[PDB]
Design a protein around this ligand. Structure first.
Ligand SMILES: O=c1nc(Nc2cccc(Cl)c2)oc2cc(Cl)oc(=O)c12
Lengths: 108, 107
């Protein structure tokens, strides 16, 4: 495992997974459970932290940028789908700011 | 810093000349663009012209602060526009380049 992917796993995912605002993002969006019948009409590439974490655990990624794009898709899906005023947007913004702060110190 | 230099000369330069970058090179002009609700929804406007000027004038203390402004710029687009708007695709395309280039920044 590259230095970069080790960092994404040990530093970035570690910080984000345990965060108090992480829970809406720890599993795929369940549109039935959440009452969101248009979710998959709007969001064509669902992504969540559970998936990213499993991919890090299973050496799915070849480059760190690939993992970073998955985090990015997760956050962007939230901004695109939700109303600007929804609390979930605030939660995503908070997590993404940590993501970027940590990525500023990633190797290589 | 070494990182701020990189964000200016490597990251911003690449984004700036991109064929999808023209809506992002200057602040959103809500009057000229006919967006009467833009500043009621978007409370922290950001654009690449502003970031570039901040880079030129040594406004940033750290690389992360600059990266946060890029992020705010893209996030504003996703929040304000309709999912089906072309500008969302343009922002997505630019943001993927941003993250690719950031992955190679000096640690
Ligand atoms: O991305 C999202 N993730 C979640 N997770 C979630 C939500 C409630 C319970 C549990 Cl266990 C998980 O909920 C959402 C609700 C809405 Cl409205 O928009 C969203 O984009 C998301």
């Amino acid at each position: 495992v590259t230095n970069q992917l080790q960092y994404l796993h040990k530093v970035v995912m570690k910080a984000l997974w345990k965060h108090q605002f992480a829970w809406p993002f720890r599993q795929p969006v369940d549109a039935v459970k959440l009452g969101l019948p248009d979710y998959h009409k709007i969001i064509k590439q669902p992504m969540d932290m559970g998936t990213i974490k499993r991919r890090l655990e299973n050496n799915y990624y070849w480059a760190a940028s690939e993992c970073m794009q998955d985090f990015n898709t997760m956050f962007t899906n939230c901004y695109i789908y939700n109303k600007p005023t929804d609390d979930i947007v605030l939660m995503a913004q908070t997590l993404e700011k940590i993501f970027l702060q940590k990525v500023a110190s990633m190797p290589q």
